Design a protein around this ligand. Structure first.
Ligand SMILES: Nc1ncnc2c1ncn2[C@@H]1O[C@H](COP(=O)(O)OP(=O)(O)OP(=O)(O)OP(=O)(O)OP(=O)(O)OC[C@H]2O[C@@H](n3cnc4c(N)ncnc43)[C@H](O)[C@@H]2O)[C@@H](O)[C@H]1O
Length: 214
């Protein structure tokens, strides 16, 4: 099956992606992880994102579409995948449609703007796997360590307050309209749409999603 996760910065998409992946056995396609990885390794496809991400702005549709195409062509996506942080704009959604990439579920994670900044300062990550934690809301089993590899967790270069605020603006400008776009898609019978309350505890959000996805 094919799923799109939608919602504001910090809404909880990546956290639940992990559960959907390890549960329904489809790969997580995370544009944020992919772009960070490209920057880290200096890969020709995506190293360009470095400064853009630092400024809290969106990377060009052109760049991210290329990355997803390349990722989605891999054997492990043949029977479905989870798009997490993509599409991010209408043109990104349109490209998918032009390329014949329909999806079965669009899942919207609703969180009030006012919870976003506070929430994200607690965020810690394991960049090699893309796993994410929160020091209060979803701590690692061992303080400061990734559960799976025991490596020291880091803080994302773009998780600073000022940068989160810029991302939230860009989100409302460019990304928020995908709610209407995919709702219309659902009204046309092209996919299923569901909104979840992303203010509930992680386990409860996981439970709600299970109800939706079966
Ligand atoms: N398609 C695209 N086009 C153009 N540019 C692109 C692009 N994709 C990426 N980019 C670029 O990359 C930069 C960052 O993009 P990206 O990394 O994709 O997203 P973000 O806006 O930076 O923040 P997230 O979307 O990763 O948050 P989330 O909804 O996954 O929530 P999370 O599960 O982490 O949780 C947040 C925190 O809270 C915790 N938490 C999770 N759920 C809950 C809960 N229910 N209650 C309490 N805490 C919770 C977590 O543990 C964590 O600490 C962009 O600004 C841009 O430059």
């Amino acid at each position: 099956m094919r799923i799109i996760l939608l919602g504001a910065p910090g809404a909880g998409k990546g956290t639940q992606a992990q559960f959907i992946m390890e549960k329904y056995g489809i790969p997580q396609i995370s544009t944020g992880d992919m772009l960070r990885a490209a920057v880290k390794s200096g890969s020709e496809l995506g190293k360009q994102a470095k400064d853009i991400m630092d400024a809290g702005k969106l990377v060009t549709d052109e760049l991210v579409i290329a990355l997803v195409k390349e990722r989605i062509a891999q054997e492990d996506c043949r029977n479905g995948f989870l798009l997490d942080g993509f599409p991010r704009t209408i043109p990104q959604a349109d490209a998918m449609k032009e390329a014949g990439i329909n999806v079965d579920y669009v899942l919207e994670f609703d969180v009030p703007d006012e919870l976003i900044v506070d929430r994200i300062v607690g965020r810690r990550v394991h960049a090699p796997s893309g796993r994410v934690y929160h020091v209060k809301f979803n701590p690692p089993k061992v303080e400061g360590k990734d559960d799976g590899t025991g490596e020291e967790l880091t803080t994302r270069k773009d998780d600073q307050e000022e940068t989160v605020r810029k991302r939230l603006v860009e989100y409302h400008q460019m990304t928020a309209p995908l709610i209407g776009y995919y709702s219309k898609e659902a009204e046309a019978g092209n996919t299923k749409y569901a909104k979840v309350d992303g203010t509930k505890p992680v386990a409860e959000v996981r439970a709600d999603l299970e109800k939706i996805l079966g």
